[PDB]
Amino acid sequence: EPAARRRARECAVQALYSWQLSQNDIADVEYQFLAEQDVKDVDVLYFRELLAGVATNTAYLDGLMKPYLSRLLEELGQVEKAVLRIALYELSKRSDVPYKVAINEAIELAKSFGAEDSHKFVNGVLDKAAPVIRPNKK
């Protein structure tokens, strides 16, 4: 896939984090990010689609996630929550994004912005959640 798509995920992790903390209108959050962050190499369409995708679907995306969280208790990190919401969004709503790509990009996004062993927890949730969303695993 294009590096611009990966960049869009990276920028969406940051912007969705903005929104999670600020609860500003996601349109404003999109605009502000496009005006203040270097975005020259970014799939700007997909960035928009990831943002609104997640921001208007938080309840649905958290619900797909919850059954695999109910026990390991440290609230859940804001970066991890954004990474997981992106991954689940792609798995539920984006057929143009392949199964292994959604999970692999999530794992790398967690490596970059996440805590110490964030990638391993993100991995744990996803390959429990992903087969339930994509029985074909494609």
Binding site: Y17, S18, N24
Partner: protein
């Protein structure tokens, strides 16, 4: 204070604990929004070592914003840099 040409407060946070840094960030954001201000970001930076980085800017601050920020005591193990104007 107040009369500074660019009415913008830039904040950079560092910490080893992401629970501490997300909480501190939440509190700064809340302080801005309580006091009639607006927030740009916050955004997380790529982690380097054991260190989490957060950037948050406050625009349109009131005097109450500035006073409340300066009265704000963040958790031990969270480092800050603040620039005004």
């Amino acid at each position: 204070l107040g009369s500074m040409q660019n009415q913008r407060i830039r904040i950079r946070l560092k910490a080893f604990d992401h629970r501490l840094i997300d909480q501190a960030t939440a509190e700064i954001v809340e302080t801005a929004k309580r006091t009639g201000a607006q927030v740009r970001g916050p955004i997380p930076l790529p982690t380097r070592s054991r260190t989490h980085l957060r950037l948050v800017d406050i625009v349109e601050p009131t005097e109450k914003t500035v006073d409340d920020l300066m009265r704000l005591d963040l958790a031990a193990g969270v480092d800050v840099q603040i620039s005004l104007g």
